[PDB]
Amino acid sequence: GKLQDVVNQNAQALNTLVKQLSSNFGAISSVLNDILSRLDPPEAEVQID
Amino acid sequence: AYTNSFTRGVYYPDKVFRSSVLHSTQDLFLPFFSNVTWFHAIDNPVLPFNDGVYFASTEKSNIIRGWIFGTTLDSKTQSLLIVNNATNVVIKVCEFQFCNDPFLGVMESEFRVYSSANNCTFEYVSKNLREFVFKNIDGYFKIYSKHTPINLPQGFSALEPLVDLPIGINITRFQTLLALHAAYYVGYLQPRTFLLKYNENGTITDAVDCALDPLSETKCTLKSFTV
Amino acid sequence: EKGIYQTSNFRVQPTESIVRFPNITNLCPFGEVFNATRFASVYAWNRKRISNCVADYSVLYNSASFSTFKCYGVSPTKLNDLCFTNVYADSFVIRGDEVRQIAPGQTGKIADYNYKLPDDFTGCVIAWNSNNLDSKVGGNYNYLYRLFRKSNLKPFERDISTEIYQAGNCYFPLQSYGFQPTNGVGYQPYRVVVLSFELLHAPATVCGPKKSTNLVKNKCVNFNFNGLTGTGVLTESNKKFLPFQQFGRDIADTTDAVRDPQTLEILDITPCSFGGVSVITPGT
Amino acid sequence: VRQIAPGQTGKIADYNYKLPDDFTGCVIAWNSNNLDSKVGGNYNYLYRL
Ligand SMILES: *[C@@H]1O[C@H](CO)[C@@H](O)[C@H](O)[C@H]1NC(C)=O
Ligand SMILES: *[C@@H]1O[C@H](CO)[C@@H](O)[C@H](O)[C@H]1NC(C)=O
Ligand SMILES: *[C@@H]1O[C@H](CO)[C@@H](O)[C@H](O)[C@H]1NC(C)=O
Ligand SMILES: *[C@@H]1O[C@H](CO)[C@@H](O)[C@H](O)[C@H]1NC(C)=O
Ligand SMILES: *[C@@H]1O[C@H](CO)[C@@H](O)[C@H](O)[C@H]1NC(C)=O
Ligand SMILES: *[C@@H]1O[C@H](CO)[C@@H](O)[C@H](O)[C@H]1NC(C)=O
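Above: the input entities. Below: the structure tokens describing the complete assembly.
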């Protein structure tokens, strides 16, 4: 278990990290290129930020 | 008459392929082991369609024909008519004077489902178990279906959308059309964050309802089917 | 100092741009939205679907015949290069000072009683003058709007009820438009149209005017599928899309496969080969 | 006159004068009926189409 746990923990963290790319954080969308292709820089700047 | 909806009313929540990923969707489904009202046709009252309907239908002869969705089922009110003519699928949205007992005659003899219409904004034309799901969100009607062979099995089967339609009608009551010369079950849907497990082929072949029981809630929290 | 240092990033650059759009030539009719002879009353605003078409929104834009043309969730010059499932064209006529009332978070008679836009509105609101066409001497009272009713409305709901409003005291909830050509701009008619775009992953049907180009595989491309932009190498794959699915998705919610809009075939999208570049140096 | 600002579009902005997004100045405008509008037409003023 002690080794296995280690692996899982690291793997688990990575998964969480990756999943965090699917969150809006308040932006209009979680996809960068979506905003890049929908708004001009003066407004897309805020979402991207 | 009532019965129990074992593993039914599960539809692809999104238009998007996913493979071997345990994806959790919050959306109004038919809750597992729900308590689905059974009707026998050996009986066509006006039921509510408040938050969707799991309209299952087992029948052997395609006598179950049509669906009627009204707010008052009178000329003035708005009535959607999904009429499946066994020659060509038909849909209309038109505001109808309805005969209380609509039906088709059949070698075809009668077509007696209505009396008149005034104005409207659409028309479209084209051993077993057949499930169907009907929803309306912000005036967008969405229909899902599934035709499976069985001579309600607690066998899981995904449901895939076929038509959207922007009825914009404020629907609260509905109906069902039968053709004289056939059991059918209405459930009601509620918002239940289902966690669904697509297989390698990207087909939804198992799911857990988050609010069924402690085991299911635990499964939901861990994003897992085994605990 | 002597050691191995992770300096930079190796990222293959794309060779060419692929744009793939469904090939439809039907240019959809904005004309009878904008030279529509009559719009109905603002309470009974007119809906029309817009789909299976190609829409030059730019030619609409630079027409300069519109007083207020302002856009949310999308930008007028950007939205030429986008493909949408549906375009919802809602038009009516409202008063002058109240054109600003057509926006999310906005209140008043028409907003709280005739038309609301949702907070997450993803469309474009336009309005222009109609003195020559909507204001007749002595009065044109065809236009009507709602005054009294129990509650506040949800986005894009229609209420066409004529029930006599109950104050406690009975009044007709609808009052009409007394409209002279002689009046001030504040009391001058406005022809109003709003387009709300149904952004969905369903097969897009309204698309901007853009030449869809040829498809090339197994080479770094900068691609654009129905307005979905990206970069990568497109290969044949076996992800069995069922006929209704279009965009296969990845864990991180980045599109991983796409059904090509012209030939309904699936393409796996692999990010162009990249990595870290480390530099091995004995101490300088 | 509102078109004279960063992030602003239209005939004059997209065709005659743009201000940058990071504009660090001051925009002023006033009336010129008495001085810029003559009976029958003063067509001296011109712009790009
Ligand atoms: C299900 O319906 C039956 C009627 O046969 C009733 O006894 C039972 O209380 C119902 N249960 C729920 C949860 O609605
Ligand atoms: C829908 O119709 C019912 C009457 O059947 C009514 O009570 C309800 O308020 C309506 N909904 C809306 C949003 O108007
Ligand atoms: C059509 O709708 C109008 C309201 O716009 C109504 O006055 C009329 O009665 C309807 N048509 C018929 C035949 O009733
Ligand atoms: C996927 O489909 C293939 C053939 O279409 C089949 O052999 C395979 O068993 C399917 N996968 C699953 C999990 O059923
Ligand atoms: C695209 O054009 C091809 C012929 O080149 C045709 O077979 C196909 O149906 C078209 N698809 C769309 C979406 O227009
Ligand atoms: C409306 O008519 C004018 C001609 O009077 C035309 O220039 C314009 O393009 C028309 N509107 C649309 C949306 O095409």
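Note for the figure: The pocket of 2-acetamido-2-deoxy-beta-D-glucopyranose (ligand 1) is lined by residues B 2, 35 (CB under 6 Å).
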